[PDB]
Write an enzyme that holds these catalytic residues in place. Structure first.
Site, PDB file in Angstrom:
ATOM      1  N   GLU A  54       0.796  -1.220   0.000  1.00 58.11           N
ATOM      2  CA  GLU A  54       0.000   0.000   0.000  1.00 58.11           C
ATOM      3  C   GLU A  54       0.832   1.274   0.000  1.00 58.11           C
ATOM      4  O   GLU A  54       1.914   1.337   0.588  1.00 58.11           O
ATOM      5  CB  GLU A  54      -0.973   0.018   1.182  1.00 58.11           C
ATOM      6  CG  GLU A  54      -0.326   0.044   2.548  1.00 58.11           C
ATOM      7  CD  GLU A  54      -1.301   0.485   3.620  1.00 58.11           C
ATOM      8  OE1 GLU A  54      -1.781   1.634   3.540  1.00 58.11           O
ATOM      9  OE2 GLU A  54      -1.592  -0.308   4.536  1.00 58.11           O
ATOM     10  N   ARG A  65      -2.561  10.905   6.977  1.00 54.25           N
ATOM     11  CA  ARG A  65      -2.475  10.222   5.691  1.00 54.25           C
ATOM     12  C   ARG A  65      -3.809  10.229   4.957  1.00 54.25           C
ATOM     13  O   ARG A  65      -3.877   9.880   3.780  1.00 54.25           O
ATOM     14  CB  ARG A  65      -2.022   8.771   5.873  1.00 54.25           C
ATOM     15  CG  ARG A  65      -0.574   8.594   6.291  1.00 54.25           C
ATOM     16  CD  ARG A  65      -0.239   7.111   6.369  1.00 54.25           C
ATOM     17  NE  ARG A  65      -0.336   6.467   5.061  1.00 54.25           N
ATOM     18  CZ  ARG A  65      -0.518   5.163   4.874  1.00 54.25           C
ATOM     19  NH1 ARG A  65      -0.630   4.346   5.914  1.00 54.25           N
ATOM     20  NH2 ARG A  65      -0.573   4.672   3.644  1.00 54.25           N
ATOM     21  N   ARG A  69      -5.724   5.720  -0.782  1.00 62.68           N
ATOM     22  CA  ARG A  69      -4.547   4.877  -0.938  1.00 62.68           C
ATOM     23  C   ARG A  69      -4.572   4.143  -2.265  1.00 62.68           C
ATOM     24  O   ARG A  69      -5.619   4.000  -2.897  1.00 62.68           O
ATOM     25  CB  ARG A  69      -4.510   3.807   0.157  1.00 62.68           C
ATOM     26  CG  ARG A  69      -4.695   4.305   1.575  1.00 62.68           C
ATOM     27  CD  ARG A  69      -3.369   4.516   2.272  1.00 62.68           C
ATOM     28  NE  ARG A  69      -3.563   4.785   3.695  1.00 62.68           N
ATOM     29  CZ  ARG A  69      -4.127   5.887   4.181  1.00 62.68           C
ATOM     30  NH1 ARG A  69      -4.557   6.839   3.361  1.00 62.68           N
ATOM     31  NH2 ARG A  69      -4.267   6.037   5.491  1.00 62.68           N
ATOM     32  N   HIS A  85     -10.760   4.683   2.987  1.00 56.82           N
ATOM     33  CA  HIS A  85      -9.961   3.951   3.959  1.00 56.82           C
ATOM     34  C   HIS A  85     -10.152   2.428   3.937  1.00 56.82           C
ATOM     35  O   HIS A  85     -10.558   1.828   4.933  1.00 56.82           O
ATOM     36  CB  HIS A  85     -10.251   4.503   5.360  1.00 56.82           C
ATOM     37  CG  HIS A  85      -9.193   4.188   6.370  1.00 56.82           C
ATOM     38  ND1 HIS A  85      -9.011   2.926   6.890  1.00 56.82           N
ATOM     39  CD2 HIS A  85      -8.254   4.973   6.948  1.00 56.82           C
ATOM     40  CE1 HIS A  85      -8.005   2.946   7.747  1.00 56.82           C
ATOM     41  NE2 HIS A  85      -7.528   4.176   7.800  1.00 56.82           N
TER      42      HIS A  85
END
Length: 96
Positions: A54, A65, A69, A85
């Site tokens: 990731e 963050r 992702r 998420h």
């Protein structure tokens, strides 16, 4: 399950940045970028440990963050984008 495919051009510009860094093996903004993604909840196809990794897709203005992702699969051109998420994932199509 994977929620279909999505063109790279349709994702936030930061997603393109993330992929460019992955192409050069970093360095990344977070030393954590590049760790193995366990696919613990089996949302993505079942693979052996280490098949997935990731990386952060920066969220503008975020101190953390964030929730975006990109998860790489070891197969050629296999990359997944999540904006919630790890809740859902969409296969990234870099050709569009």
């Amino acid at each position: 399950d994977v929620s279909g495919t999505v063109c790279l051009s349709a994702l936030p510009p930061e997603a393109t940045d993330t992929l460019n860094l992955i192409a050069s093996d970093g360095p990344f903004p977070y030393s954590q970028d590049g760790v193995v993604f366990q696919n613990r909840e089996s949302v993505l196809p079942t693979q052996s440990y280490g098949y997935y990794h990731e990386y952060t897709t920066i969220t503008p203005g975020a101190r953390t963050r964030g929730t975006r992702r990109i998860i790489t699969g070891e197969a050629t051109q296999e990359d997944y984008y999540t904006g919630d998420h790890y809740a859902t994932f969409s296969l990234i199509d870099q050709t569009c």
